[PDB]
């Protein structure tokens, strides 16, 4: 933990964070950050300061329901609406914040779909996005539609079947902890500092 973070919903628009991180958990995971999000968050807080970054999980209508992986975009329409609404909150509350995003498994599909759909002016403020166990990795050829490769980092372990077109969960799918502790926040921090200094 903390596995629930609502720093954007509870954000002070007169004291905006420099960086706002919006993260979607995997299927059946707890809180709004699940198993990987808190590790990313602690590293972001150290890099930007506790008051310099807002950590926001995708809660609300995102139920992280296992069966929704089988829906067209790998998550539900209601979930996409929730994550889009959070990106819009960030844009409205803190128009000069640099955004960053991420997701695990269904949450990676949700991040990709939401980012695809977002108004381009808001999408263009997401300096980096990390995807773990990306369930649309094969189908989307390793990319988030409408979003540049340089700003994307996919963590797809060998033998994680969801990265090669399946929805079956095998052991490598449970081995993203090291990535969440190290290279994923490293990438986000790098990409934010690239644009912010």
Q: Is 160 a catalytic residue?
A: yes
The domain spanning residue 76 has which CATH number?
3.40.50.1820
Catalytic residue among 7, 105, 114, 179: 105
* Contact in structure between 26 and 107 (CB atoms under 8 Å): yes
- Per the annotation, the verdict on 173 as an active-site residue is yes
Distance of CA 53 to the CA centre of its chain: 15
Q: Which domain holds residue 193?
A: 1-197
Q: Which residues pair with 98 in a beta bridge?
A: 19
Q: How many domains does the chain have?
A: 1
End-to-end CA distance of the chain: 29
Which of 27, 39, 114, 173 is the catalytic position? 173
User: What span, in angstroms and rounded, lies between the C-alpha atoms of 16 and 14?
Assistant: 6
- Residue 65 is classified by DSSP as -
Helix (H, G, I), strand (E, B) or coil at 153: strand
């Amino acid at each position: 933990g903390r596995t629930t973070r609502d720093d954007l919903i509870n954000g002070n628009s007169a004291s905006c964070a420099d960086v706002i991180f919006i993260y979607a958990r995997g299927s059946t995971e707890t809180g709004n950050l699940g198993t990987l999000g808190p590790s990313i968050a602690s590293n972001l807080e150290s890099a930007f300061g506790k008051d310099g970054v807002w950590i926001q999980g995708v809660g609300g209508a995102y139920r992280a329901t296992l069966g929704d992986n089988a829906l067209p975009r790998g998550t539900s329409s209601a979930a996409i609406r929730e994550m889009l609404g959070l990106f819009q909150q960030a844009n409205t509350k803190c128009p000069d914040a640099t955004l960053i995003a991420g997701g695990y498994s269904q949450g990676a599909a949700l991040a990709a779909a939401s980012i695809e759909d977002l108004d381009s002016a808001i999408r263009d403020k997401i300096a980096g996005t990390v995807l773990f166990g990306y369930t649309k990795n094969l189908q989307n050829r390793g990319r988030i539609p409408n979003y540049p490769a340089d700003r994307t980092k996919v963590f797809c372990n060998t033998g994680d079947l969801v990265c090669t077109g399946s929805l079956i969960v095998a052991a490598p799918h449970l081995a993203y902890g090291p990535d969440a502790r190290g290279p994923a926040p490293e990438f986000l921090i790098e990409k934010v500092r690239a644009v912010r200094g």
